[PDB]
Specification:
The complex is a heterotrimer of chains A (220), B (339) and C (211). Helix content of chain A is 0%, strand content 53%. Chain A is mainly beta and 220 residues long. In chain A, a hairpin with a 4-residue loop joins strand 7 and strand 8. Chain A is elongated and about 75 Å long. In chain A, 42% of the residues are buried. Chain B has 339 residues and is of the alpha+beta class. In chain B, 17% of the residues lie in helices and 36% in strands. The relative contact order of chain B is 0.22. By secondary structure, chain C is mostly beta strands. The interface between A and B is medium-sized, with 27 and 33 residues. The complex binds 2-acetamido-2-deoxy-beta-D-glucopyranose (12 copies). The site of one 2-acetamido-2-deoxy-beta-D-glucopyranose has 4 residues of chain B, from strand 14. Chain B: Glycans are attached at residues 45, 118, 125, 146, 160, 173, 179, 194, 215, 245, 251, 258, 295, 308.
């Protein structure tokens, strides 16, 4: 019955202010404090602070206090959060969370919101650069490095889908430049590097770019 | 032997049947007259547990005061729920009277008489009464007004199931007068406080806060934000809703300045209702001198929980949850069922 | 600020078995600890609070317990849906979280095949250099990958990406990408990644030389 419906995520530019909202329903709004917590990639969760919706009193994590504001529209049962002067490491999934309390104390969390993904990058739409990962001079490995595209997602295939055995395409990572990168790799018989043609097909729909990269062994 | 129990209390008062003041009118139809000589039996060698944070007397007083304000205030416009309510709004006579809470047959009130009792835990000096003392239903934020005083030391009351507290109630052992006045812009007002008396008491508060939070340096800061009812000292005076800035009241360089502290105040017509149900609008203030002299008897505080700690704890004036006001008077009482 | 250390990062388990996850607090949090399940694609959900009190709607195979600063979630009969991420919370002093433990499918130990890839000339002309180290089809999940150039340990200039546990052979694969400017890259000769894994008798080093 309780819902914390979240809005406001997406691509925020570096140094901008973002505002997240959270529409609560299914319970007595005044009776529960609301917390804002985030998870940056690879990291555990972190509390940013909370707000008492009855009177609007906020409390803030000390390291972020100066850039945060928590407020609410009591009439509309809606909670808002601002994070100012956005940085690359503000990229994270942001959650509003209902907090269980008693007459005098605040305790555990009992319902988590739907979540807002925030990506902090001032990059415009850019197609990927594709570099080979050449097999070393029984089993050999080769691949493609797909650097510096925005936004997600990219598609990688090998020999136009003919080669699927032993392929591993890694999840993209957002680099500190605001652009994504990933690698795709396949392991093949070392006896085949002299006769087989290996081509990785990278497709990036947001920029309408299709790259095919021949991956060969390197020599003079 | 007796056990903890919850039952419906009734109220008693010395309300005057001829008075037009609305607490009086409410008590005349909702309470009985005060008992002549209330008897108090002391329980020899009895130790009893109290918990001011789970005391159903608090919810019952909250209900009465909701009922009283519902019957007697007359906002011109009420923005409760999703629609508006339009009715007449004459100026009312408003001044809270003492309300005693009493148990019916087969029940009794146990009263804790340990002077330094903090609110939760055993009480070694217990007595039984039929009624509470007279408790004035003063609705205020940040400062508790016209209440009773702690009898020995200043008392810091907090539920302490976690360190993550909602409200910390400081109970003073010496009252400090606060004199607020709208002289004859009609909404401009001010409150005067003897700074010498206030800053000595605030220093003792800090000393006790220091005792309670591991000898750390105690710092006061202005409210972090939220509604004006909690960022200001909010109270009612002759039926008008005052909002006073208490920044100068919690001056850090002045504790560890003398003279009169003058806090700027405003009378507001458009308020947020402490019952928690939307907003209301009242008529502009009455003419003439508007003045209310009150005793500060307690402070409502909030402690910052997310700061770097090792040396400093930071507290901010709080309130807003009016059950905390009643809790600061009912902490010493609990209802038991006699077999 | 209280630190919650969850162990281990990845727990090998089998359907139907009993599994225990630990959370050690850096100092006393009373019994103010809770456990959450975090399935992929969904928000976290409360399993246990106050160390040992099962929340409403949680199946009976979940239980929690405590002992001073150590707290234990137990899952007695692992169903398929339970192979996922769990994390703890303390709410005694502010709110802080453990890093999370993933429960995965147990299989036999498989040492990684390790490969190292120099920067292509095409990228090197762009001005940056990416050196990639591949760990292929290994189990269990825990793997340490250290970059060393001319035997100097690198730090703060590499990123690791991992696949999900394979649906057919239950192995992981991992990439570690060291990114240098062209200038910094060409000043050194020996590039190496050192891989520590419980399937390898001794750490394995794969290295190349520029040119
Ligand atoms: C008071 O009660 C305690 C039990 O807690 C008992 O040990 C003690 O002897 C009693 N004292 C008297 C004077 O009855
Ligand atoms: C104990 O409680 C009584 C009231 O019943 C009070 O008069 C007395 O001062 C308290 N303290 C002691 C030490 O008796
Ligand atoms: C009040 O005193 C009792 C001891 O009787 C203690 O258990 C409790 O923690 C105290 N509460 C405070 C200091 O807030
Ligand atoms: C205010 O304080 C004085 C002295 O402390 C006391 O006599 C008086 O009863 C108090 N007034 C109220 C309304 O509590
Ligand atoms: C109030 O209690 C404090 C202890 O916190 C003490 O230092 C002070 O003298 C007391 N004041 C009065 C008037 O009893
Ligand atoms: C709060 O309660 C705990 C109960 O575990 C008690 O040990 C402690 O003394 C109390 N006071 C403080 C300041 O923690
Ligand atoms: C309160 O202040 C007003 C105006 O400053 C003054 O007339 C009145 O005497 C004061 N009352 C007290 C009790 O100080
Ligand atoms: C706090 O410090 C004072 C000296 O400033 C000392 O006398 C007292 O014993 C200390 N109390 C605690 C609980 O550390
Ligand atoms: C209270 O007064 C100070 C300056 O004296 C001001 O900065 C602050 O904003 C005021 N508070 C409110 C809530 O208006
Ligand atoms: C404290 O009081 C002095 C005057 O007594 C005043 O000048 C100052 O602004 C106040 N606040 C602070 C933070 O010093
Ligand atoms: C304030 O109180 C002091 C002593 O508490 C007293 O001497 C003085 O007359 C009072 N009024 C002032 C300072 O205006
Ligand atoms: C406190 O009581 C006095 C008279 O004893 C009254 O004039 C004043 O308005 C009261 N204060 C409040 C906030 O009700």
């Amino acid at each position: 019955q309780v819902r914390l419906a979240q809005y406001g995520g997406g691509v925020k530019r570096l140094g901008a202010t973002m505002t997240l909202s959270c529409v609560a329903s299914g319970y007595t709004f005044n009776d529960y404090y609301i917390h804002w917590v985030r998870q940056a990639p690879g990291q555990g969760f972190e509390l940013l602070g909370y707000i008492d919706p009855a009177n609007g009193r906020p409390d803030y994590a000390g390291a972020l206090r100066e850039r945060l504001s928590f407020y609410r529209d009591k009439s509309m049962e809606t909670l808002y959060m601002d994070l100012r002067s956005l940085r690359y490491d503000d990229t994270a999934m942001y959650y509003c969370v209902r907090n269980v309390g008693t007459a005098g104390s605040l305790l555990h969390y009992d319902h988590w919101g739907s979540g807002s993904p925030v990506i902090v990058s001032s990059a415009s739409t850019k197609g990927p650069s594709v570099f080979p990962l050449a097999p070393s001079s029984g089993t050999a490995a080769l691949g493609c490095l797909v650097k510096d595209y925005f936004p997600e997602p990219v598609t990688v295939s090998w020999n136009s889908g003919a080669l699927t055995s032993g392929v591993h395409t890694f999840p993209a990572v957002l680099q500190s430049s605001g652009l994504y990168s990933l690698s795709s790799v396949v392991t093949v018989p070392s006896s085949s590097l002299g006769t087989q043609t290996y081509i990785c097909n990278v497709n990036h729909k947001p920029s309408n770019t299709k790259v095919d990269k021949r991956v060969e062994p390197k020599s003079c | 032997v007796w056990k903890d129990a919850d039952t419906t209390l009734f109220c008693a008062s010395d309300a005057k049947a001829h008075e037009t003041e609305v607490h009086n009118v409410w008590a005349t139809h909702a309470c009985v007259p005060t008992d002549p000589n209330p008897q108090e039996i002391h329980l020899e060698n009895v130790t009893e547990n109290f918990n001011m944070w789970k005391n159903n007397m608090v919810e019952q007083m909250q209900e009465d005061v909701i009922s009283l304000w519902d019957q007697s205030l007359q906002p011109c416009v009420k923005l409760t729920g999703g629609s508006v309510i339009k009715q007449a709004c004459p100026k009312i006579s408003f001044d809270p009277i003492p309300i005693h809470y009493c148990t019916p047959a087969g029940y009794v009130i146990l009263k804790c008489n340990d002077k330094n009792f903090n609110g939760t835990g055993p009480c070694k000096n217990v007595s039984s009464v039929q009624c509470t003392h007279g408790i004035k239903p003063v609705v205020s934020t940040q400062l508790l007004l016209n209440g009773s005083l702690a009898e020995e030391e200043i008392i810091i009351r907090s539920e302490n199931l976690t360190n993550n507290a909602k409200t910390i109630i400081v109970h003073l052992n010496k009252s400090v007068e606060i004199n607020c006045t709208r002289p004859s812009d009609i909404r401009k007002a001010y409150c005067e406080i003897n700074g010498t008396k206030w800053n000595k008491v605030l220093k003792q508060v800090t000393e006790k806060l220091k005792e309670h939070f591991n000898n750390k340096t105690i710092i006061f800061q202005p409210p972090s934000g939220g509604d004006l009812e909690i960022t200001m000292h909010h109270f009612n005076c002759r039926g008008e809703f005052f909002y006073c800035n208490t920044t100068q009241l919690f001056n850090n360089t002045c504790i560890g300045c003398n003279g009169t502290i003058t806090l700027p105040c405003k009378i507001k017509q458009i308020i947020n209702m402490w019952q928690g149900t939307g907003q209301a609008m009242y008529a502009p203030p009455i003419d003439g001198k508007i003045n209310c002299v009150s005793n500060i008897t307690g402070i409502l505080l909030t402690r910052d929980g997310g700061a770097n700690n090792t040396s400093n704890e930071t507290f901010r004036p709080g309130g807003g949850n009016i059950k905390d006001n009643w809790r600061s008077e009912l902490y010493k009482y609990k209802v038991v069922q006699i077999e | 600020e209280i630190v919650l250390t969850q162990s281990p990062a990845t727990l090998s388990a089998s359907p139907g078995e009993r599994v225990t996850l630990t959370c050690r607090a850096s100092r006393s949090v009373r019994n103010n600890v809770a456990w959450y399940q975090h399935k992929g694609g969904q928000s976290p959900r409360l399993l246990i609070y106050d160390a040992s009190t099962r929340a409403a709607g949680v199946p009976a195979r979940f239980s929690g317990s405590a002992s001073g600063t150590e707290f234990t979630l137990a899952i007695s009969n692992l169903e398929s849906e339970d192979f996922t991420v769990y994390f703890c919370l303390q709410y005694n002093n502010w709110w802080t979280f453990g890093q999370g433990t993933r429960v995965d499918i147990k299989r036999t130990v498989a040492a990684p095949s390790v490969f190292i890839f120099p920067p292509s000339d095409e990228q090197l002309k762009s001005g940056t250099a990416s050196v990639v180290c591949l760990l292929n089809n290994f189990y269990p999940r825990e793997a340490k990958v250290q970059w060393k150039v001319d035997n100097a340990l690198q730090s703060g200039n590499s990123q690791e990406s991992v696949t999900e546990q394979d649906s057919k052979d239950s192995t992981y694969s991992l990439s570690s990408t060291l990114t240098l400017s062209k200038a910094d890259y060409e000043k050194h000769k020996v590039y190496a990644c050192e891989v520590t894994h419980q399937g390898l008798s001794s750490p394995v080093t794969k290295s190349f030389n520029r040119g």
